[PDB]
mmCIF file of C-alpha atoms and ligand atoms in Angstrom:
data_model
loop_
_atom_site.group_PDB
_atom_site.id
_atom_site.type_symbol
_atom_site.label_atom_id
_atom_site.label_comp_id
_atom_site.label_asym_id
_atom_site.label_seq_id
_atom_site.Cartn_x
_atom_site.Cartn_y
_atom_site.Cartn_z
ATOM 1 C CA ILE F 77 38.653 -183.103 -59.552
ATOM 2 C CA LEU F 78 41.803 -181.482 -58.028
ATOM 3 C CA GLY F 79 44.586 -183.841 -56.903
ATOM 4 C CA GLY F 80 42.832 -187.063 -57.902
ATOM 5 C CA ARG F 81 43.508 -190.115 -60.078
ATOM 6 C CA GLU F 82 41.857 -191.142 -63.373
ATOM 7 C CA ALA F 83 38.874 -193.427 -62.708
ATOM 8 C CA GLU F 84 38.820 -197.128 -63.723
ATOM 9 C CA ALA F 85 36.885 -197.293 -67.048
ATOM 10 C CA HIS F 86 33.139 -197.943 -66.371
ATOM 11 C CA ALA F 87 33.797 -198.941 -62.701
ATOM 12 C CA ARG F 88 31.078 -196.382 -61.680
ATOM 13 C CA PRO F 89 28.077 -197.163 -63.995
ATOM 14 C CA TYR F 90 25.817 -194.678 -62.092
ATOM 15 C CA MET F 91 27.993 -191.762 -63.323
ATOM 16 C CA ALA F 92 26.355 -189.297 -65.776
ATOM 17 C CA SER F 93 27.456 -186.187 -67.672
ATOM 18 C CA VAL F 94 24.881 -183.354 -67.881
ATOM 19 C CA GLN F 95 25.795 -181.599 -71.151
ATOM 20 C CA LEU F 96 24.717 -178.517 -73.078
ATOM 21 C CA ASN F 97 25.549 -178.294 -76.842
ATOM 22 C CA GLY F 98 27.926 -181.275 -76.568
ATOM 23 C CA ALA F 99 29.929 -179.582 -73.764
ATOM 24 C CA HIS F 100 29.970 -181.039 -70.248
ATOM 25 C CA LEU F 101 28.464 -178.757 -67.614
ATOM 26 C CA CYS F 102 27.758 -180.936 -64.617
ATOM 27 C CA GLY F 103 28.134 -184.412 -63.239
ATOM 28 C CA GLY F 104 25.051 -186.500 -62.497
ATOM 29 C CA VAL F 105 24.056 -189.778 -60.906
ATOM 30 C CA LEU F 106 21.596 -192.343 -62.349
ATOM 31 C CA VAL F 107 19.216 -192.915 -59.413
ATOM 32 C CA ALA F 108 16.522 -194.816 -61.428
ATOM 33 C CA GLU F 109 16.130 -196.357 -64.959
ATOM 34 C CA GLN F 110 14.776 -193.016 -66.310
ATOM 35 C CA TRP F 111 16.033 -190.567 -63.660
ATOM 36 C CA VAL F 112 19.363 -188.722 -63.146
ATOM 37 C CA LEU F 113 19.937 -186.684 -59.951
ATOM 38 C CA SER F 114 22.082 -183.493 -60.382
ATOM 39 C CA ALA F 115 22.480 -179.903 -58.976
ATOM 40 C CA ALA F 116 19.803 -177.122 -59.313
ATOM 41 C CA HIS F 117 22.162 -174.433 -60.861
ATOM 42 C CA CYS F 118 23.603 -176.603 -63.649
ATOM 43 C CA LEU F 119 21.250 -175.263 -66.341
ATOM 44 C CA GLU F 120 21.411 -171.570 -65.094
ATOM 45 C CA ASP F 121 23.870 -169.663 -67.357
ATOM 46 C CA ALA F 122 22.533 -171.971 -70.156
ATOM 47 C CA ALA F 123 21.832 -170.295 -73.505
ATOM 48 C CA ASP F 124 19.481 -171.527 -76.319
ATOM 49 C CA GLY F 125 20.717 -175.111 -76.591
ATOM 50 C CA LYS F 126 20.451 -178.883 -76.491
ATOM 51 C CA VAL F 127 20.501 -180.228 -72.886
ATOM 52 C CA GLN F 128 21.425 -183.952 -72.838
ATOM 53 C CA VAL F 129 22.545 -186.597 -70.316
ATOM 54 C CA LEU F 130 25.449 -188.879 -71.384
ATOM 55 C CA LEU F 131 25.451 -192.362 -69.837
ATOM 56 C CA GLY F 132 27.966 -195.220 -70.230
ATOM 57 C CA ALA F 133 30.997 -192.958 -70.678
ATOM 58 C CA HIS F 134 34.598 -192.867 -69.479
ATOM 59 C CA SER F 135 35.920 -190.522 -72.198
ATOM 60 C CA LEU F 136 33.688 -187.641 -73.245
ATOM 61 C CA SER F 137 35.124 -187.482 -76.847
ATOM 62 C CA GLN F 138 36.242 -191.067 -77.738
ATOM 63 C CA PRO F 139 33.584 -193.617 -78.838
ATOM 64 C CA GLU F 140 32.617 -196.400 -76.370
ATOM 65 C CA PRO F 141 30.011 -199.222 -76.843
ATOM 66 C CA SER F 142 28.426 -198.354 -73.443
ATOM 67 C CA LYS F 143 28.062 -194.583 -74.319
ATOM 68 C CA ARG F 144 24.483 -193.338 -74.991
ATOM 69 C CA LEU F 145 23.065 -189.773 -75.132
ATOM 70 C CA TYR F 146 19.654 -189.142 -73.774
ATOM 71 C CA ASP F 147 17.292 -186.159 -74.167
ATOM 72 C CA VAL F 148 15.941 -184.477 -71.014
ATOM 73 C CA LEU F 149 12.141 -185.060 -71.104
ATOM 74 C CA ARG F 150 11.481 -183.367 -67.712
ATOM 75 C CA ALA F 151 13.740 -181.205 -65.442
ATOM 76 C CA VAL F 152 12.331 -181.116 -61.877
ATOM 77 C CA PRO F 153 14.251 -178.662 -59.601
ATOM 78 C CA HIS F 154 13.704 -178.692 -55.826
ATOM 79 C CA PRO F 155 10.801 -176.296 -55.054
ATOM 80 C CA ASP F 156 12.803 -174.447 -52.346
ATOM 81 C CA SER F 157 15.934 -174.032 -54.533
ATOM 82 C CA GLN F 158 17.072 -170.464 -55.384
ATOM 83 C CA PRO F 159 19.978 -169.150 -57.543
ATOM 84 C CA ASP F 160 21.306 -167.074 -54.583
ATOM 85 C CA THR F 161 21.719 -170.076 -52.185
ATOM 86 C CA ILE F 162 23.409 -173.503 -52.119
ATOM 87 C CA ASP F 163 20.419 -174.824 -50.119
ATOM 88 C CA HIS F 164 18.196 -177.570 -51.667
ATOM 89 C CA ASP F 165 20.637 -177.667 -54.631
ATOM 90 C CA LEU F 166 18.962 -180.708 -56.223
ATOM 91 C CA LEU F 167 17.539 -181.277 -59.703
ATOM 92 C CA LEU F 168 15.960 -184.468 -61.025
ATOM 93 C CA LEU F 169 16.188 -185.061 -64.796
ATOM 94 C CA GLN F 170 13.872 -187.596 -66.458
ATOM 95 C CA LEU F 171 15.400 -189.109 -69.594
ATOM 96 C CA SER F 172 13.476 -189.221 -72.963
ATOM 97 C CA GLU F 173 13.302 -193.057 -72.602
ATOM 98 C CA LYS F 174 14.509 -195.645 -70.003
ATOM 99 C CA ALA F 175 18.300 -196.095 -69.893
ATOM 100 C CA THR F 176 19.705 -199.254 -71.547
ATOM 101 C CA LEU F 177 21.117 -201.059 -68.493
ATOM 102 C CA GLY F 178 24.343 -203.012 -68.663
ATOM 103 C CA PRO F 179 27.706 -203.516 -66.914
ATOM 104 C CA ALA F 180 28.445 -199.814 -67.738
ATOM 105 C CA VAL F 181 24.984 -198.351 -66.996
ATOM 106 C CA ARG F 182 23.505 -199.207 -63.573
ATOM 107 C CA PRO F 183 21.567 -196.906 -61.163
ATOM 108 C CA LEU F 184 23.142 -196.294 -57.740
ATOM 109 C CA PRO F 185 21.195 -197.080 -54.534
ATOM 110 C CA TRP F 186 20.852 -193.754 -52.674
ATOM 111 C CA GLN F 187 20.656 -193.423 -48.833
ATOM 112 C CA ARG F 188 17.017 -193.245 -47.581
ATOM 113 C CA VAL F 189 17.803 -193.248 -43.784
ATOM 114 C CA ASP F 190 18.491 -189.675 -42.552
ATOM 115 C CA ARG F 191 21.750 -190.314 -40.583
ATOM 116 C CA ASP F 192 24.840 -188.069 -40.816
ATOM 117 C CA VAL F 193 27.884 -189.696 -42.466
ATOM 118 C CA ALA F 194 30.358 -190.307 -39.626
ATOM 119 C CA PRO F 195 33.126 -187.626 -39.811
ATOM 120 C CA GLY F 196 36.318 -189.320 -40.949
ATOM 121 C CA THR F 197 34.522 -191.730 -43.323
ATOM 122 C CA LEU F 198 36.396 -191.964 -46.618
ATOM 123 C CA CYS F 199 34.081 -191.051 -49.516
ATOM 124 C CA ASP F 200 34.547 -191.236 -53.269
ATOM 125 C CA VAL F 201 33.655 -188.182 -55.416
ATOM 126 C CA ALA F 202 34.022 -188.582 -59.243
ATOM 127 C CA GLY F 203 33.569 -186.262 -62.223
ATOM 128 C CA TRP F 204 34.758 -184.593 -65.429
ATOM 129 C CA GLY F 205 35.300 -181.261 -63.606
ATOM 130 C CA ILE F 206 38.494 -179.128 -63.984
ATOM 131 C CA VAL F 207 41.699 -180.944 -62.822
ATOM 132 C CA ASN F 208 43.928 -177.879 -62.162
ATOM 133 C CA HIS F 209 43.456 -174.198 -61.171
ATOM 134 C CA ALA F 210 44.336 -173.283 -64.813
ATOM 135 C CA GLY F 211 41.023 -175.019 -65.611
ATOM 136 C CA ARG F 212 42.175 -178.061 -67.670
ATOM 137 C CA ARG F 213 39.018 -179.972 -68.608
ATOM 138 C CA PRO F 214 39.712 -183.768 -68.359
ATOM 139 C CA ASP F 215 38.441 -185.977 -71.223
ATOM 140 C CA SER F 216 38.375 -189.171 -69.076
ATOM 141 C CA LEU F 217 36.501 -189.574 -65.739
ATOM 142 C CA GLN F 218 38.504 -188.566 -62.639
ATOM 143 C CA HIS F 219 37.907 -189.344 -58.943
ATOM 144 C CA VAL F 220 39.269 -188.585 -55.424
ATOM 145 C CA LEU F 221 38.806 -190.143 -51.925
ATOM 146 C CA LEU F 222 37.957 -187.458 -49.418
ATOM 147 C CA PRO F 223 37.284 -187.933 -45.673
ATOM 148 C CA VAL F 224 33.984 -186.507 -44.300
ATOM 149 C CA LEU F 225 34.568 -183.350 -42.251
ATOM 150 C CA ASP F 226 32.366 -182.703 -39.153
ATOM 151 C CA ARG F 227 29.794 -179.885 -39.526
ATOM 152 C CA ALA F 228 31.124 -177.998 -36.437
ATOM 153 C CA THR F 229 34.592 -177.563 -38.051
ATOM 154 C CA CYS F 230 32.968 -176.835 -41.391
ATOM 155 C CA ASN F 231 30.770 -174.036 -39.876
ATOM 156 C CA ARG F 232 33.740 -172.116 -38.317
ATOM 157 C CA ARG F 233 34.027 -168.389 -39.232
ATOM 158 C CA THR F 234 37.437 -169.236 -40.885
ATOM 159 C CA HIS F 235 35.547 -171.968 -42.817
ATOM 160 C CA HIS F 236 31.906 -171.667 -44.027
ATOM 161 C CA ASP F 237 30.539 -169.552 -41.084
ATOM 162 C CA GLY F 238 27.363 -171.538 -40.269
ATOM 163 C CA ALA F 239 26.379 -171.947 -43.942
ATOM 164 C CA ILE F 240 26.437 -175.793 -43.585
ATOM 165 C CA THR F 241 22.893 -176.793 -42.540
ATOM 166 C CA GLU F 242 21.833 -180.214 -41.147
ATOM 167 C CA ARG F 243 20.768 -180.944 -44.802
ATOM 168 C CA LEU F 244 24.350 -180.375 -46.044
ATOM 169 C CA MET F 245 27.632 -182.271 -45.440
ATOM 170 C CA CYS F 246 31.396 -181.590 -45.817
ATOM 171 C CA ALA F 247 34.578 -183.263 -47.042
ATOM 172 C CA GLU F 248 38.257 -182.241 -46.657
ATOM 173 C CA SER F 249 39.664 -179.857 -49.283
ATOM 174 C CA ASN F 250 43.443 -179.793 -48.644
ATOM 175 C CA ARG F 251 44.700 -179.709 -52.305
ATOM 176 C CA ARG F 252 42.524 -182.791 -53.054
ATOM 177 C CA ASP F 253 38.938 -181.587 -53.680
ATOM 178 C CA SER F 254 35.975 -181.421 -56.106
ATOM 179 C CA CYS F 255 35.769 -178.347 -58.340
ATOM 180 C CA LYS F 256 34.025 -176.455 -61.240
ATOM 181 C CA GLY F 257 32.131 -178.971 -63.361
ATOM 182 C CA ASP F 258 32.154 -181.657 -60.588
ATOM 183 C CA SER F 259 28.922 -180.021 -59.336
ATOM 184 C CA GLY F 260 25.861 -182.317 -59.524
ATOM 185 C CA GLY F 261 28.213 -185.280 -59.198
ATOM 186 C CA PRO F 262 28.004 -188.126 -56.669
ATOM 187 C CA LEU F 263 29.604 -188.490 -53.225
ATOM 188 C CA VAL F 264 29.573 -192.208 -52.528
ATOM 189 C CA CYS F 265 30.336 -193.750 -49.088
ATOM 190 C CA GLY F 266 30.249 -197.552 -48.747
ATOM 191 C CA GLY F 267 28.808 -198.041 -52.254
ATOM 192 C CA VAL F 268 25.772 -195.879 -51.355
ATOM 193 C CA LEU F 269 25.007 -192.322 -52.617
ATOM 194 C CA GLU F 270 25.269 -189.969 -49.624
ATOM 195 C CA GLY F 271 25.872 -186.546 -51.206
ATOM 196 C CA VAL F 272 25.599 -184.506 -54.430
ATOM 197 C CA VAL F 273 28.333 -181.944 -55.259
ATOM 198 C CA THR F 274 26.816 -178.421 -54.971
ATOM 199 C CA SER F 275 26.589 -176.192 -58.128
ATOM 200 C CA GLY F 276 27.355 -173.063 -56.064
ATOM 201 C CA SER F 277 30.410 -171.048 -57.074
ATOM 202 C CA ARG F 278 33.148 -171.844 -54.509
ATOM 203 C CA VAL F 279 36.980 -171.804 -54.180
ATOM 204 C CA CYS F 280 38.591 -175.323 -54.632
ATOM 205 C CA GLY F 281 41.843 -176.728 -53.175
ATOM 206 C CA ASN F 282 41.933 -174.520 -50.032
ATOM 207 C CA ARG F 283 41.627 -176.553 -46.768
ATOM 208 C CA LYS F 284 39.988 -173.618 -44.900
ATOM 209 C CA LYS F 285 37.013 -173.716 -47.361
ATOM 210 C CA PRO F 286 35.813 -177.377 -47.402
ATOM 211 C CA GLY F 287 33.759 -179.043 -50.143
ATOM 212 C CA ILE F 288 29.969 -178.693 -49.815
ATOM 213 C CA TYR F 289 27.690 -181.677 -50.717
ATOM 214 C CA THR F 290 23.850 -181.907 -50.478
ATOM 215 C CA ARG F 291 22.807 -184.924 -48.298
ATOM 216 C CA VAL F 292 20.414 -187.087 -50.396
ATOM 217 C CA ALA F 293 18.780 -188.824 -47.361
ATOM 218 C CA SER F 294 17.770 -185.333 -46.184
ATOM 219 C CA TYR F 295 15.646 -185.001 -49.425
ATOM 220 C CA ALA F 296 14.565 -188.718 -49.609
ATOM 221 C CA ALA F 297 10.782 -187.974 -49.479
ATOM 222 C CA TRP F 298 11.053 -185.388 -52.313
ATOM 223 C CA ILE F 299 13.106 -187.762 -54.549
ATOM 224 C CA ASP F 300 10.584 -190.599 -53.831
ATOM 225 C CA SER F 301 7.681 -188.218 -54.630
ATOM 226 C CA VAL F 302 9.219 -187.122 -58.023
ATOM 227 C CA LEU F 303 10.378 -190.626 -59.153
ATOM 228 C CA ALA F 304 6.798 -191.952 -58.507
HETATM 229 O O1 J56 X 1733 30.361 -174.095 -64.253
HETATM 230 C C1 J56 X 1733 29.941 -175.231 -64.472
HETATM 231 N N1 J56 X 1733 30.524 -176.114 -65.315
HETATM 232 C C2 J56 X 1733 31.806 -176.041 -65.883
HETATM 233 C C3 J56 X 1733 32.466 -174.844 -66.202
HETATM 234 C C4 J56 X 1733 33.764 -174.928 -66.672
HETATM 235 C C5 J56 X 1733 34.370 -176.164 -66.820
HETATM 236 C C6 J56 X 1733 33.613 -177.269 -66.479
HETATM 237 BR BR1 J56 X 1733 34.405 -178.994 -66.609
HETATM 238 N N2 J56 X 1733 32.368 -177.245 -66.035
HETATM 239 C C7 J56 X 1733 28.699 -175.775 -63.718
HETATM 240 S S1 J56 X 1733 27.159 -175.320 -64.576
HETATM 241 C C8 J56 X 1733 26.984 -173.834 -63.566
HETATM 242 C C9 J56 X 1733 27.487 -174.246 -62.214
HETATM 243 N N3 J56 X 1733 28.661 -175.120 -62.377
HETATM 244 C C10 J56 X 1733 29.645 -175.328 -61.466
HETATM 245 O O2 J56 X 1733 30.599 -176.052 -61.699
HETATM 246 C C11 J56 X 1733 29.539 -174.601 -60.128
HETATM 247 N N4 J56 X 1733 30.657 -174.705 -59.218
HETATM 248 N N5 J56 X 1733 30.751 -175.775 -58.369
HETATM 249 C C12 J56 X 1733 31.941 -175.699 -57.821
HETATM 250 C C13 J56 X 1733 32.662 -174.571 -58.289
HETATM 251 C C14 J56 X 1733 33.933 -174.024 -58.083
HETATM 252 C C15 J56 X 1733 34.293 -172.861 -58.748
HETATM 253 C C16 J56 X 1733 33.396 -172.227 -59.613
HETATM 254 C C17 J56 X 1733 32.137 -172.762 -59.848
HETATM 255 C C18 J56 X 1733 31.781 -173.933 -59.188
#
């Protein structure tokens, strides 16, 4: 998270860390007791290794009572996802067993009604992604409040040149943004999951290239289908 604050310890119980060989790769959001929603390209450059979801954390390294590592029993990518495109950049991970729910582990209600988030709405994106352009990996959870940018502005040739589909949404990127490793993370507006940070390689902190987030309500039927 570029230009953000450190998150309040365990204030976002839905928050998950998709890790490979004890190193954080992507953010994730607990959508059900045994399901974590993330991005489709998080396990791409992955070598022979242990893929695990960390729940109940604030610090990745320090011990916490709430912290629990889970094995990925099933990794369901969106059928229409491709490595080449940021479209349908969703991946549902089923945990080895149901998550032990508590004040620090609670699934987030995700938007089921397909309505665009009103441009200007202040949304909260959190993650353990790089905090500076030098690539400093934060140990503790970080977050930033970004206003939703309208698709028309986002699709300008100077911006994303029509790449933002009706299934995607945007947020402002002037210094304050989401970045590398924030991918797969949640975009929460009014305590409800609206977007998922894309795992597509982009350029953070520049206002002319806004943040791209996959609208969950746009893929509500697929999520429902998988979780059942
Ligand atoms: O690269 C990734 N994770 C990573 C790398 C270094 C440091 C940290 Br913290 N996390 C994940 S796994 C493969 C796709 N990923 C992305 O973060 C993709 N992505 N998402 C935004 C972004 C910006 C610049 C470059 C890549 C970007």
